[PDB]
Amino acid sequence: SSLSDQLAQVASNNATVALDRKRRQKLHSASLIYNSKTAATQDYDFIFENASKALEELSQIEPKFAIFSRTLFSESSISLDRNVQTKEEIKDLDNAINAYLLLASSKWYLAPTLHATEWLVRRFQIHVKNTEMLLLSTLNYYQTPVF
Amino acid sequence: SSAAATDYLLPESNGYLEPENELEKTFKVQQSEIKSSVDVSTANKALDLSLKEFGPYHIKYAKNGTHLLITGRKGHVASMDWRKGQLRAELFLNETCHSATYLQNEQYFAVAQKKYTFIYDHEGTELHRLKQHIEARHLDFLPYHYLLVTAGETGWLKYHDVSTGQLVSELRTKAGPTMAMAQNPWNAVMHLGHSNGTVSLWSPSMPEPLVKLLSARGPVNSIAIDRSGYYMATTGADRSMKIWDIRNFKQLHSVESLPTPGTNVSISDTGLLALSRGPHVTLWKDALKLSGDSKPCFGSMGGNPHRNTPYMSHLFAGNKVENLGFVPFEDLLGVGHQTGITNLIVPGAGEANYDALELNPFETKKQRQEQEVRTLLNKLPADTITLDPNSIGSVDKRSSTIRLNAKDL
Amino acid sequence: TRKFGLVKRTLNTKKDQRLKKNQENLTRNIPQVSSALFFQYNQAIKPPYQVLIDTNFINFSIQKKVDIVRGMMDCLLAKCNPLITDCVMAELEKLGPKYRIALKLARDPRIKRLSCSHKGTYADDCLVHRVLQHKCYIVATNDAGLKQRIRKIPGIPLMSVGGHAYVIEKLPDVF
Amino acid sequence: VRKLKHHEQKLLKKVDFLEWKQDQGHRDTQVMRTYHIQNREDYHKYNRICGDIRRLANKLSLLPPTDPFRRKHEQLLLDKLYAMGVLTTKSKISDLENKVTVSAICRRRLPVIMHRLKMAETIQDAVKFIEQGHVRVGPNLINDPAYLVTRNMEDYVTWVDNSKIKKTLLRYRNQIDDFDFS
Amino acid sequence: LERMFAKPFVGQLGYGHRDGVYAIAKNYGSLNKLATGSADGVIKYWNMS
RNA sequence: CAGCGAAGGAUUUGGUGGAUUACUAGCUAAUAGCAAUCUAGGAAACUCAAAGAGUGCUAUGGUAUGGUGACGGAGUGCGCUG
Ligand SMILES: [Zn+2]
């Protein structure tokens, strides 16, 4: 194989790491609520606090989201970076993300689940890391703007 | 005192690996075991390019570890961002290239071709063909002085100012072709190794070498200098690694009778010593120290704690490695060999806390532009290169040490 | 499946804008002739005249012993306002301490003075520009080059020290 | 590199990353962009020839004007440089410093005489055609563009037969014979 | 940079005097006021702003 | 249409494998070990770069917090202002 092929492989491996400001902007402007110019200027604290509000709304609708408030939506997860822990911690949080996605697959018609999984999109990069489970979970909604 | 209190403010910690048992030796720890034990970002930094058809690949990293410059022996020179997947020059110069280096950036690089040294821009267009630098085999850039230094099969050492464009110095080595070449990062003098077993320390002011050391017998295969400018490891072709004090010119260690001649040495920013003897790469920790208990051994005869066994080793079983280079601010060792590039996760092997206004691994396009203009503005003249850097504020070593009050005149 | 006529890419000095000689990557303006003018008459100027002096006119005035305002008055038979621009004054000051008499005869409260707004002290450029802008000025000069410039631009009367009094040429109402 | 400020233009003026003193105005680059030379070092292997003929013309000027060795060798050199068509006439030996040019020894190359006699229509397409292998000088095919010609062989620069662009121009002028297989 | 930035002349004030300035006095309480007198007996008070 | 004509026919293309020289096995410190181990012109764009110009943003240390028990707070006395 060729050098550009092997480098496309290392780009696909390092897809989520922000190695300068321009890649961080292009990578953090990928939101599910806001457009790119607002989404690039938002913080982690802002999107976390309104995603925690939306998870409280989603949890009082369906009470199986409270353990996701315990682990995936806690305040240690504001500073938890995805691509800094090993493969075993990665598989732990990726089956956490799979649990959240196949729990909240049914709830996709009501905006608290959009504002709640906004934080999985922007903190844990599940649109590019945990992407097969995201497509498979929301496959039903294909005539809808959320898909 | 206040400058030394900054070690609280230092963000990161250095890496390591520690045995935690007496059965668990450290040189028998495998690279797949490291890649399982460390995180996904570092495991993805440990790249491997299998480029089989062109020759053994001389490796080179930019001075922040952002860009990689490989040269095949046949013609294949590629400058790339090895940690994204972005290459920005892939040019096949069908004559035998030997070496390359970046100049002050990823934006220009100099390659040493069949005879002439060429200089290429960021995307690979040829900027310059140097009519001097007749047969280079070793290029190295002096970044604070903006000088491309060139040595090779001719017995000549040439310093070329990259900014003005002007050949600063031509010096007769007078000792045949230059077998090895390294730069002291401390004081920017060039240690060249000849076929006499002689290292000579050179400056572009004096047409004679500043110092001539008798390192080895036979020729001198490789030289590496610490970034503190204190120790120098030279491998000769007489199967002899030798650790040298640079400042006082004592010989610290003499590891004679290596099993096969060490073809490369390198010294990391945290003082590891990476020797390479063909298929084998072997790294020692704390080998550049004064005491005889820091002499690098290969085994500990009966479990002696006062024997510096290898910190880690690796075997490139197919091939013979071309050169070694540590990745600057990361825990990796990039070795270029016959079938391309391999990074090795060496945990003790990089400055965890860089300074971001000397040279920044996260630097942007605007920061590159302004830092280029600012370092160009504070470029040091080539005459200020002395054996010690602190000798350009002083008075003459003539001109009597007491100032004179005109009564005594 | 390579390409034919393959070359090594070098830089193009004719094309590359990264180098300096290739850093060079409509509304007309025809200024109307002045409404102060007939064909070459300058029908609009009327006494009290105002006269722009320069340095060799002052030097020739003192060398011929003519007063400035009285020489102007008995040349034109009208009331004159003489004007020293700051560049003419700069030129007289730069002439040194040999020309102290000329400088402190130009320092005269009867000689009013303009304020030129440009860099440098080239009085010929300043006088030519401010006279071809406005056409309400007499130019008193003795430079041959400035005399040729002024008498080539139309509608501008020219005064000059000739003999033992001032003469005036392109003013068609002197008697 | 940054289009420096004014205290910048003044503080360092001789800095120029693009064009140095020893580039000689990039005349090698300029003339190989003109006559479209494939690889590097052709310019300097012509410039060595120019320097050698001006050096030996200098030492033929050195020798006294009466000996037949000198006069036979300068007329022999002048006739050989006419015979390879570097010159256009057999004039003065002062033309062996005024008129020998690395330009003219590039003018005798095979793509540029092809553009000269309108066989191609640009020198780039000439190098296209002779890398694709269509032309010949006399019997033998020419593959490399570095084959410059002599004064006799500007008459037998012709394509090969079965060259299909020759067949397209024959069927353009509909003189296309096919008994001669092209 | 100092030897190229050395542009010390601010400007002359007014039109000067007629006969050369032989006396000057600043006032020690206001920043910009200046009195000057020449050889022909004229004195002037100046706003230096 | 005729003709050809077996649960279909034609064109184009991506990937991989085998040949493109005449087949004596991998590694290493090699008379042997190991192999589980050596060690004790044009078009497109969420494309990639190189530069230029303008605009936006409190863009705010004229010499940086009220305080290394060397300190702070309270009160008194001196000082200061009208
Ligand atoms: Zn003026």
Curated annotation (Swiss-Prot), chain A:
It comes from Saccharomyces cerevisiae (strain ATCC 204508 / S288c). Present with 18200 molecules/cell in log phase SD medium. The chain holds residues 2 to 148 of 1769 of the full protein. It is found in: Nucleus, Nucleolus; Mitochondrion. Involved in nucleolar processing of pre-18S ribosomal RNA. Required for optimal pre-ribosomal RNA transcription by RNA polymerase I together with a subset of U3 proteins required for transcription (t-UTPs). Involved in ribosome biosynthesis. The modification N-acetylserine is found at S1. This is U3 small nucleolar RNA-associated protein 10. It comes from the Eukaryota. Belongs to the HEATR1/UTP10 family. Interacts with snoRNA U3. Interacts with MPP10. Component of the ribosomal small subunit (SSU) processome composed of at least 40 protein subunits and snoRNA U3. In the absence of snoRNA3, forms a complex with other t-UTPs. This complex can associate with pre-18S ribosomal RNAs.
UniProtKB/Swiss-Prot annotation, chain B:
Keywords: Nucleus, Repeat, Ribonucleoprotein, Ribosome biogenesis, rRNA processing, WD repeat. WD repeats lie at residues 51-92, 173-212, 215-254, 257-294. Transmembrane segments: none annotated. GO terms for cellular component: 90S preribosome; nucleolus; nucleoplasm; preribosome, small subunit precursor; small-subunit processome. Coiled coil: none annotated. Its main location: nucleus. One of its GO terms (biological process) is endonucleolytic cleavage in 5'-ETS of tricistronic rRNA transcript (SSU-rRNA, 5.8S rRNA, LSU-rRNA). It is found in: Nucleus, Nucleolus. Present with 5800 molecules/cell in log phase SD medium. Interacts with snoRNA U3. Interacts with MPP10. Component of the ribosomal small subunit (SSU) processome composed of at least 40 protein subunits and snoRNA U3. Involved in nucleolar processing of pre-18S ribosomal RNA. This is U3 small nucleolar RNA-associated protein 7. It comes from Saccharomyces cerevisiae (strain ATCC 204508 / S288c) (Baker's yeast). The chain holds residues 58 to 466 of 554 of the full protein.
Swiss-Prot record, chain C:
CDD domains: PIN_Fcf1-like. One of its GO terms (molecular function) is RNA endonuclease activity. Its main location: nucleus. It is found in: Nucleus, Nucleolus. Transmembrane segments: none annotated. GO terms for biological process: endonucleolytic cleavage in 5'-ETS of tricistronic rRNA transcript (SSU-rRNA, 5.8S rRNA, LSU-rRNA); endonucleolytic cleavage in ITS1 to separate SSU-rRNA from 5.8S rRNA and LSU-rRNA from tricistronic rRNA transcript (SSU-rRNA, 5.8S rRNA, LSU-rRNA); endonucleolytic cleavage to generate mature 5'-end of SSU-rRNA from (SSU-rRNA, 5.8S rRNA, LSU-rRNA); maturation of SSU-rRNA. Interacts with FAF1. Essential protein involved in pre-rRNA processing and 40S ribosomal subunit assembly. Required for the early cleavage steps of 35S rRNA at the A(0), A(1), and A(2) sites. This is rRNA-processing protein FCF1. The lineage of its organism: Eukaryota, Fungi, Dikarya, Ascomycota, Saccharomycotina.
Swiss-Prot record, chain E:
It comes from the Eukaryota. WD repeats lie at residues 16-49. It is found in: Nucleus, Nucleolus. Present with 6620 molecules/cell in log phase SD medium. Required for ribosomal RNA processing. Belongs to the WD repeat DCAF13/WDSOF1 family. Interacts with snoRNA U3. Interacts with NOP1 and MPP10. Component of the ribosomal small subunit (SSU) processome composed of at least 40 protein subunits and snoRNA U3. This is Protein SOF1. It comes from Saccharomyces cerevisiae (strain ATCC 204508 / S288c).
